[PDB]
Design a protein around this ligand. Structure first.
Ligand code: CL
Ligand code: CL
Ligand code: CL
Ligand code: CL
Ligand code: CL
Ligand code: CL
Ligand code: CL
Ligand code: CL
Ligand code: CL
Ligand code: CL
Ligand code: CL
Ligand code: CL
Ligand code: NA
Ligand code: NA
Ligand code: NA
Ligand code: NA
Ligand code: NA
Ligand code: NA
Lengths: 103, 103, 103
């Protein structure tokens, strides 16, 4: 039920705006921003490159639907990367804090 | 059964101490330290920020209970982030090495 | 079915070569390169250290077998780290793009 959601963004500005918005709105309890990424992906049968930052979002499956909505709104690109990885287990007290602070 | 455990820490000092302790004690076969994170989380109905490093720990569900104990002991904060993500599949020889070196 | 595959490499050179090769060959739709990692692992009952970069690969279980083959070929080390984490859910349009561009 708890999840670590990955989202990449084009700038520190967007990274912080999204991280703050998600935590403020209780759609996530914690968000880690990892700067300096190089992203290589396919677009129109063409391999392109971009500079990005990674957001690691600690949330839940119940908040995810709302999280996607808020992210698509704040994110500048039409089809933003938003993928959730399941949390199999962890520090019990940490996960409780995670649920306790997510809506 | 094999897992990638995420742990964030406040300094390079703690990052290295925990990484070394886990590998030395065979509670993990490998630990990756990613520096330069910005963390934004909720605390007392207040969105706060911190500078951290991320540890990506390659371990197993059997070692996890012991890993949590050692991490809570070494980690300076009371409720440290310790979340395990399940490994669905991977390089067979790598995963064997992972189990072979984890207790 | 969709997965986020983690791979660590010894240099930016290898990181880019593998990222490009996987996307070009439609074995992945996107690859993120995170530089500056410190890796601590066990080798011959000895805890060693290395400088690496992390590749976060967006792919599928159907492409994984082929991905492993290509990675082992391009990667300079015999037993490279290749671990897949399952994607529980995500931006539907993003995941479709992911499958649509992976073979
Ligand atoms: Cl950056
Ligand atoms: Cl496309
Ligand atoms: Cl660049
Ligand atoms: Cl994106
Ligand atoms: Cl740092
Ligand atoms: Cl709190
Ligand atoms: Cl700062
Ligand atoms: Cl913490
Ligand atoms: Cl580097
Ligand atoms: Cl070994
Ligand atoms: Cl170094
Ligand atoms: Cl390796
Ligand atoms: Na991206
Ligand atoms: Na850009
Ligand atoms: Na943290
Ligand atoms: Na701090
Ligand atoms: Na490695
Ligand atoms: Na090296």
């Amino acid at each position: 039920m708890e999840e670590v959601v990955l989202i990449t963004v084009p700038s520190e500005e967007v990274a912080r705006t999204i991280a703050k918005a998600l935590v403020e709105e209780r759609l996530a309890a914690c968000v880690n921003i990892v700067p300096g990424l190089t992203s290589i992906y396919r677009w129109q049968g063409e391999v392109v490159e971009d500079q990005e930052l990674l957001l690691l979002v600690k949330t839940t499956t119940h908040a995810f639907p709302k999280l996607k909505e808020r992210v698509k709104a704040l994110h500048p690109y039409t089809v933003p990367e938003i993928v959730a990885l399941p949390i199999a287990e962890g520090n019990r007290e940490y996960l409780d804090w995670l649920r306790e602070n997510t809506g």
